[PDB]
Amino acid sequence: ETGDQRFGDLVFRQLAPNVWQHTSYLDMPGFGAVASNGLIVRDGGRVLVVDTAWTDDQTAQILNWIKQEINLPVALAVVTHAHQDKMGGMNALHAAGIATYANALSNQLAPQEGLVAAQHSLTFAANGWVEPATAPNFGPLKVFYPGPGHTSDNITVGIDGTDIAFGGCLIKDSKAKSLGNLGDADTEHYAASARAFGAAFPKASMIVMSHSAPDSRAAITHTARMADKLR
Ligand SMILES: CC(C)c1cccc2c(-c3ccc(Cn4cncn4)cc3)c(C(=O)O)[nH]c12
Ligand code: NA
Ligand SMILES: [Zn+2]
Ligand SMILES: [Zn+2]
């Protein structure tokens, strides 16, 4: 659509005045060319990234796009679990000198997953909110661990000052026929974790997610319902 700017085999879509969705694609036998989404946030004179693309080369295109279209330094990136669609491009971020952050558990898992760990580890209070001293300079990004679901390590991100909350791999859209790739999922706890995400960001009306276009809060409801069926 008109909002879907094309650049370097990726797609960039403005969602709010200072927020864009990045989308990259990986062709895999049996799956088609699977889209994965992350975010780009301008916070004053700097840019913040949520999630890499599937590959280093694609993630380099995210950074090229930022330079062309925003032309401000990228201060940090936060990646939302140790799977290829979210952390496949860590080397590109590190080649740009960008400080990278992930759940401590994601950093522990990354090497066995064939991924490069983020430089910095986030830890979370018992109620799920990030311990702020582990998320220095996060600006409007509000990071929440909802519990195991799509993976054990999945985290979520709200953008303060906007209507947006990012569910990453945890949340699928209201028309989705399944929960996507459950290979590393916690099927017992998924429904509660999806609901915890919704309760952490109760003001959010635009739910952004890894594998479908932004949706209403019906994405959370429908995801939790599909997840309840797994119990
Ligand atoms: C583990 C990771 C590297 C990976 C590889 C290949 C596919 C996926 C998917 C995925 C699979 C199917 C669909 C189709 N679909 C659309 N809405 C509901 N299902 C969507 C995503 C996910 C995911 O679910 O995070 N991770 C993936
Ligand atoms: Na909220
Ligand atoms: Zn995943
Ligand atoms: Zn995914």
mmCIF file of C-alpha atoms and ligand atoms in Angstrom:
data_model
loop_
_atom_site.group_PDB
_atom_site.id
_atom_site.type_symbol
_atom_site.label_atom_id
_atom_site.label_comp_id
_atom_site.label_asym_id
_atom_site.label_seq_id
_atom_site.Cartn_x
_atom_site.Cartn_y
_atom_site.Cartn_z
ATOM 1 C CA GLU A 1 0.000 0.000 0.000
ATOM 2 C CA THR A 2 0.939 3.674 -0.226
ATOM 3 C CA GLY A 3 2.350 3.613 3.324
ATOM 4 C CA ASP A 4 4.676 0.720 2.481
ATOM 5 C CA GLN A 5 7.960 2.328 1.412
ATOM 6 C CA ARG A 6 10.238 -0.070 -0.448
ATOM 7 C CA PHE A 7 14.004 0.044 0.091
ATOM 8 C CA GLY A 8 16.710 -2.611 -0.318
ATOM 9 C CA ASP A 9 14.271 -5.567 -0.523
ATOM 10 C CA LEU A 10 12.767 -4.420 2.809
ATOM 11 C CA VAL A 11 9.601 -2.460 3.547
ATOM 12 C CA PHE A 12 9.314 0.517 5.912
ATOM 13 C CA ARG A 13 5.915 1.767 7.090
ATOM 14 C CA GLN A 14 5.362 4.848 9.232
ATOM 15 C CA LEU A 15 3.006 4.016 12.104
ATOM 16 C CA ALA A 16 3.159 7.269 14.102
ATOM 17 C CA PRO A 17 5.116 10.555 13.877
ATOM 18 C CA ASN A 18 8.372 9.056 15.241
ATOM 19 C CA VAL A 19 7.728 5.325 14.677
ATOM 20 C CA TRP A 20 8.266 3.091 11.640
ATOM 21 C CA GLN A 21 7.861 -0.651 11.142
ATOM 22 C CA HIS A 22 10.672 -2.469 9.310
ATOM 23 C CA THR A 23 9.852 -5.669 7.413
ATOM 24 C CA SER A 24 12.237 -8.243 5.949
ATOM 25 C CA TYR A 25 11.556 -11.543 4.206
ATOM 26 C CA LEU A 26 13.141 -14.985 4.124
ATOM 27 C CA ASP A 27 12.181 -17.613 1.530
ATOM 28 C CA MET A 28 12.168 -21.096 3.099
ATOM 29 C CA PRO A 29 10.968 -24.382 1.561
ATOM 30 C CA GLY A 30 7.452 -25.090 2.742
ATOM 31 C CA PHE A 31 6.874 -21.636 4.255
ATOM 32 C CA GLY A 32 6.988 -19.111 1.434
ATOM 33 C CA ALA A 33 8.787 -15.797 1.863
ATOM 34 C CA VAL A 34 8.023 -15.159 5.534
ATOM 35 C CA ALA A 35 7.762 -11.528 6.633
ATOM 36 C CA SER A 36 9.217 -10.428 9.960
ATOM 37 C CA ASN A 37 8.594 -7.000 11.469
ATOM 38 C CA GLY A 38 10.457 -4.800 13.922
ATOM 39 C CA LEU A 39 10.420 -1.109 14.833
ATOM 40 C CA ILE A 40 12.439 2.062 14.357
ATOM 41 C CA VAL A 41 11.805 4.912 16.820
ATOM 42 C CA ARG A 42 13.158 8.448 16.607
ATOM 43 C CA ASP A 43 13.681 9.809 20.125
ATOM 44 C CA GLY A 44 14.803 13.399 19.672
ATOM 45 C CA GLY A 45 18.246 13.404 18.096
ATOM 46 C CA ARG A 46 18.753 9.632 18.086
ATOM 47 C CA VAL A 47 17.171 6.458 16.740
ATOM 48 C CA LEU A 48 16.254 3.263 18.591
ATOM 49 C CA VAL A 49 15.731 -0.109 16.875
ATOM 50 C CA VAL A 50 13.569 -3.041 17.987
ATOM 51 C CA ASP A 51 14.675 -6.359 16.416
ATOM 52 C CA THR A 52 17.051 -7.095 13.584
ATOM 53 C CA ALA A 53 15.995 -8.458 10.204
ATOM 54 C CA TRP A 54 16.487 -12.154 9.337
ATOM 55 C CA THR A 55 20.048 -11.588 8.085
ATOM 56 C CA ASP A 56 23.043 -9.316 8.462
ATOM 57 C CA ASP A 57 22.680 -8.016 4.897
ATOM 58 C CA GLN A 58 19.026 -7.127 5.493
ATOM 59 C CA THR A 59 19.890 -5.449 8.788
ATOM 60 C CA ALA A 60 22.532 -3.385 6.994
ATOM 61 C CA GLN A 61 19.675 -2.148 4.783
ATOM 62 C CA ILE A 62 17.705 -1.082 7.872
ATOM 63 C CA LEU A 63 20.696 1.013 8.913
ATOM 64 C CA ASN A 64 21.148 2.373 5.380
ATOM 65 C CA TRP A 65 17.460 3.378 5.352
ATOM 66 C CA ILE A 66 17.794 5.110 8.717
ATOM 67 C CA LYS A 67 20.761 7.122 7.432
ATOM 68 C CA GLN A 68 18.906 8.128 4.270
ATOM 69 C CA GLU A 69 15.468 8.843 5.718
ATOM 70 C CA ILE A 70 16.220 10.037 9.279
ATOM 71 C CA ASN A 71 19.953 10.864 9.267
ATOM 72 C CA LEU A 72 20.475 10.613 13.031
ATOM 73 C CA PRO A 73 22.662 8.176 14.972
ATOM 74 C CA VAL A 74 21.266 4.849 16.144
ATOM 75 C CA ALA A 75 21.811 4.840 19.906
ATOM 76 C CA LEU A 76 20.712 1.299 20.738
ATOM 77 C CA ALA A 77 18.816 -1.765 19.622
ATOM 78 C CA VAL A 78 16.748 -4.159 21.714
ATOM 79 C CA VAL A 79 16.040 -7.638 20.337
ATOM 80 C CA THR A 80 13.066 -9.573 21.574
ATOM 81 C CA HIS A 81 14.200 -13.237 21.650
ATOM 82 C CA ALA A 82 16.886 -15.614 20.370
ATOM 83 C CA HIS A 83 15.435 -16.634 16.998
ATOM 84 C CA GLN A 84 16.819 -15.814 13.553
ATOM 85 C CA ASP A 85 14.047 -13.381 12.594
ATOM 86 C CA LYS A 86 14.806 -11.207 15.663
ATOM 87 C CA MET A 87 18.593 -11.612 16.114
ATOM 88 C CA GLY A 88 19.822 -12.793 12.706
ATOM 89 C CA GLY A 89 21.434 -9.417 12.010
ATOM 90 C CA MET A 90 23.360 -8.708 15.216
ATOM 91 C CA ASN A 91 26.699 -8.500 13.388
ATOM 92 C CA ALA A 92 25.387 -5.624 11.272
ATOM 93 C CA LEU A 93 24.397 -3.697 14.406
ATOM 94 C CA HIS A 94 27.769 -4.311 16.015
ATOM 95 C CA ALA A 95 29.584 -3.200 12.832
ATOM 96 C CA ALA A 96 27.782 0.134 13.312
ATOM 97 C CA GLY A 97 28.825 0.515 16.937
ATOM 98 C CA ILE A 98 25.225 0.258 18.149
ATOM 99 C CA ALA A 99 24.759 -0.828 21.765
ATOM 100 C CA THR A 100 22.632 -3.971 21.749
ATOM 101 C CA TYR A 101 20.312 -5.287 24.463
ATOM 102 C CA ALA A 102 18.361 -8.496 25.000
ATOM 103 C CA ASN A 103 16.802 -10.473 27.812
ATOM 104 C CA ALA A 104 19.641 -12.125 29.738
ATOM 105 C CA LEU A 105 18.068 -15.469 28.812
ATOM 106 C CA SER A 106 18.192 -14.557 25.113
ATOM 107 C CA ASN A 107 21.902 -13.809 25.441
ATOM 108 C CA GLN A 108 22.417 -17.153 27.164
ATOM 109 C CA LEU A 109 20.544 -18.978 24.382
ATOM 110 C CA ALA A 110 21.963 -17.087 21.424
ATOM 111 C CA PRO A 111 25.180 -19.089 20.876
ATOM 112 C CA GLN A 112 23.442 -22.465 20.876
ATOM 113 C CA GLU A 113 20.836 -21.023 18.499
ATOM 114 C CA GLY A 114 23.602 -20.057 16.066
ATOM 115 C CA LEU A 115 23.124 -16.367 16.864
ATOM 116 C CA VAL A 116 25.367 -13.607 18.202
ATOM 117 C CA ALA A 117 24.436 -12.407 21.695
ATOM 118 C CA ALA A 118 23.568 -8.813 22.395
ATOM 119 C CA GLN A 119 26.250 -6.872 24.264
ATOM 120 C CA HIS A 120 24.021 -6.092 27.243
ATOM 121 C CA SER A 121 21.550 -8.136 29.274
ATOM 122 C CA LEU A 122 18.163 -6.983 30.530
ATOM 123 C CA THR A 123 16.765 -8.474 33.703
ATOM 124 C CA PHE A 124 13.196 -8.324 34.904
ATOM 125 C CA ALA A 125 11.385 -7.884 38.174
ATOM 126 C CA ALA A 126 9.000 -10.596 39.327
ATOM 127 C CA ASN A 127 6.049 -8.570 37.990
ATOM 128 C CA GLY A 128 7.619 -8.611 34.502
ATOM 129 C CA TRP A 129 8.802 -5.019 34.170
ATOM 130 C CA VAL A 130 12.440 -4.535 33.217
ATOM 131 C CA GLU A 131 14.767 -3.562 36.034
ATOM 132 C CA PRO A 132 15.479 -0.017 34.773
ATOM 133 C CA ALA A 133 19.166 0.013 35.697
ATOM 134 C CA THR A 134 19.629 -2.734 33.084
ATOM 135 C CA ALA A 135 17.924 -0.629 30.373
ATOM 136 C CA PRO A 136 19.901 2.628 30.453
ATOM 137 C CA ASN A 137 18.959 5.287 27.917
ATOM 138 C CA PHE A 138 15.874 3.428 26.663
ATOM 139 C CA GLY A 139 13.890 6.671 26.367
ATOM 140 C CA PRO A 140 10.273 5.919 25.466
ATOM 141 C CA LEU A 141 10.830 2.152 25.188
ATOM 142 C CA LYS A 142 9.097 0.321 28.042
ATOM 143 C CA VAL A 143 10.214 -3.304 28.180
ATOM 144 C CA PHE A 144 8.065 -6.060 29.690
ATOM 145 C CA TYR A 145 8.651 -9.803 30.087
ATOM 146 C CA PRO A 146 5.158 -11.361 29.917
ATOM 147 C CA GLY A 147 6.116 -14.925 30.736
ATOM 148 C CA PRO A 148 6.986 -17.861 28.492
ATOM 149 C CA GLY A 149 4.920 -18.189 25.357
ATOM 150 C CA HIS A 150 6.220 -18.177 21.809
ATOM 151 C CA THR A 151 9.591 -18.823 23.482
ATOM 152 C CA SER A 152 10.812 -18.890 27.073
ATOM 153 C CA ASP A 153 12.736 -15.643 26.547
ATOM 154 C CA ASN A 154 10.238 -13.543 24.567
ATOM 155 C CA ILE A 155 9.994 -9.875 25.610
ATOM 156 C CA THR A 156 7.658 -7.074 24.572
ATOM 157 C CA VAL A 157 8.020 -3.306 24.179
ATOM 158 C CA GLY A 158 5.631 -0.373 24.589
ATOM 159 C CA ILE A 159 6.400 3.045 23.115
ATOM 160 C CA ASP A 160 5.567 5.793 25.559
ATOM 161 C CA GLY A 161 3.856 8.787 23.984
ATOM 162 C CA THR A 162 2.177 6.617 21.348
ATOM 163 C CA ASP A 163 -0.714 4.171 21.010
ATOM 164 C CA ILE A 164 1.721 1.364 20.123
ATOM 165 C CA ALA A 165 2.766 -1.811 21.882
ATOM 166 C CA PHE A 166 4.986 -4.420 20.226
ATOM 167 C CA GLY A 167 4.254 -8.070 20.936
ATOM 168 C CA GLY A 168 6.941 -9.540 18.718
ATOM 169 C CA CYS A 169 6.577 -13.257 18.145
ATOM 170 C CA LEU A 170 4.130 -13.701 20.996
ATOM 171 C CA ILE A 171 1.146 -12.072 19.277
ATOM 172 C CA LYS A 172 -0.507 -13.026 15.979
ATOM 173 C CA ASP A 173 -3.229 -11.026 14.249
ATOM 174 C CA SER A 174 -6.975 -11.352 14.780
ATOM 175 C CA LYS A 175 -7.374 -13.257 11.493
ATOM 176 C CA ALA A 176 -4.475 -15.663 12.038
ATOM 177 C CA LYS A 177 -5.274 -19.349 11.649
ATOM 178 C CA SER A 178 -2.497 -20.492 13.997
ATOM 179 C CA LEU A 179 0.176 -19.250 16.383
ATOM 180 C CA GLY A 180 2.924 -19.658 13.783
ATOM 181 C CA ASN A 181 6.137 -21.404 14.763
ATOM 182 C CA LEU A 182 5.639 -23.198 18.096
ATOM 183 C CA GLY A 183 8.919 -25.145 17.999
ATOM 184 C CA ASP A 184 10.261 -23.436 21.152
ATOM 185 C CA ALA A 185 6.921 -22.491 22.705
ATOM 186 C CA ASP A 186 5.641 -23.031 26.238
ATOM 187 C CA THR A 187 2.173 -24.294 25.463
ATOM 188 C CA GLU A 188 0.957 -24.411 29.072
ATOM 189 C CA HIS A 189 1.800 -20.771 29.856
ATOM 190 C CA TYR A 190 1.268 -19.111 26.465
ATOM 191 C CA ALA A 191 -2.304 -17.920 27.074
ATOM 192 C CA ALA A 192 -1.415 -16.270 30.379
ATOM 193 C CA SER A 193 1.655 -14.633 28.836
ATOM 194 C CA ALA A 194 -0.350 -13.179 25.944
ATOM 195 C CA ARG A 195 -2.855 -11.784 28.431
ATOM 196 C CA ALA A 196 -0.060 -10.367 30.608
ATOM 197 C CA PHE A 197 1.226 -8.426 27.591
ATOM 198 C CA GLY A 198 -2.222 -6.918 27.129
ATOM 199 C CA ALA A 199 -2.486 -6.018 30.818
ATOM 200 C CA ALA A 200 1.001 -4.432 30.830
ATOM 201 C CA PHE A 201 0.052 -2.043 28.009
ATOM 202 C CA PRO A 202 -3.667 -1.445 28.600
ATOM 203 C CA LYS A 203 -3.727 1.907 26.781
ATOM 204 C CA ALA A 204 -2.271 0.552 23.541
ATOM 205 C CA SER A 205 -4.648 0.488 20.588
ATOM 206 C CA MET A 206 -2.147 -0.375 17.823
ATOM 207 C CA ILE A 207 -0.635 -3.797 18.409
ATOM 208 C CA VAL A 208 2.473 -4.395 16.319
ATOM 209 C CA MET A 209 3.766 -7.925 15.919
ATOM 210 C CA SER A 210 6.438 -9.872 14.104
ATOM 211 C CA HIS A 211 4.397 -11.757 11.515
ATOM 212 C CA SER A 212 1.379 -9.716 10.555
ATOM 213 C CA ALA A 213 0.448 -6.136 9.913
ATOM 214 C CA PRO A 214 -0.499 -3.948 12.890
ATOM 215 C CA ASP A 215 -3.886 -4.747 14.377
ATOM 216 C CA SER A 216 -6.266 -3.733 17.130
ATOM 217 C CA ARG A 217 -6.290 -5.313 20.583
ATOM 218 C CA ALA A 218 -8.340 -8.123 19.001
ATOM 219 C CA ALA A 219 -4.948 -9.587 18.085
ATOM 220 C CA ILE A 220 -4.239 -10.126 21.780
ATOM 221 C CA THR A 221 -7.674 -11.622 22.455
ATOM 222 C CA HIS A 222 -7.439 -13.983 19.491
ATOM 223 C CA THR A 223 -3.852 -14.992 20.276
ATOM 224 C CA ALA A 224 -4.755 -15.814 23.879
ATOM 225 C CA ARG A 225 -7.752 -17.836 22.679
ATOM 226 C CA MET A 226 -5.665 -19.909 20.253
ATOM 227 C CA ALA A 227 -3.135 -20.373 23.051
ATOM 228 C CA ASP A 228 -5.804 -21.574 25.496
ATOM 229 C CA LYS A 229 -6.630 -24.347 23.021
ATOM 230 C CA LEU A 230 -3.054 -25.661 23.414
ATOM 231 C CA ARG A 231 -3.599 -26.480 27.102
HETATM 232 C C1 LIG B 1 11.973 -19.684 14.349
HETATM 233 C C2 LIG B 1 12.011 -18.594 13.306
HETATM 234 C C3 LIG B 1 13.423 -18.419 12.784
HETATM 235 C C4 LIG B 1 10.970 -18.860 12.209
HETATM 236 C C5 LIG B 1 11.259 -19.479 10.993
HETATM 237 C C6 LIG B 1 10.260 -19.711 10.038
HETATM 238 C C7 LIG B 1 8.947 -19.339 10.272
HETATM 239 C C8 LIG B 1 8.651 -18.733 11.494
HETATM 240 C C9 LIG B 1 7.435 -18.245 12.073
HETATM 241 C C10 LIG B 1 6.074 -18.247 11.384
HETATM 242 C C11 LIG B 1 5.582 -19.409 10.817
HETATM 243 C C12 LIG B 1 4.354 -19.390 10.167
HETATM 244 C C13 LIG B 1 3.633 -18.203 10.085
HETATM 245 C C14 LIG B 1 2.261 -18.138 9.374
HETATM 246 N N1 LIG B 1 1.342 -17.437 10.240
HETATM 247 C C15 LIG B 1 0.914 -16.178 10.095
HETATM 248 N N2 LIG B 1 0.087 -15.916 11.137
HETATM 249 C C16 LIG B 1 0.037 -17.037 11.901
HETATM 250 N N3 LIG B 1 0.817 -17.962 11.343
HETATM 251 C C17 LIG B 1 4.136 -17.039 10.653
HETATM 252 C C18 LIG B 1 5.361 -17.063 11.298
HETATM 253 C C19 LIG B 1 7.772 -17.744 13.319
HETATM 254 C C20 LIG B 1 6.896 -17.144 14.374
HETATM 255 O O1 LIG B 1 5.715 -17.526 14.480
HETATM 256 O O2 LIG B 1 7.421 -16.345 15.180
HETATM 257 N N4 LIG B 1 9.081 -17.872 13.507
HETATM 258 C C21 LIG B 1 9.648 -18.491 12.448
HETATM 259 NA NA NA B 2 -0.479 1.110 28.038
HETATM 260 ZN ZN ZN B 3 10.586 -16.649 17.418
HETATM 261 ZN ZN ZN B 4 9.052 -14.983 14.714
#
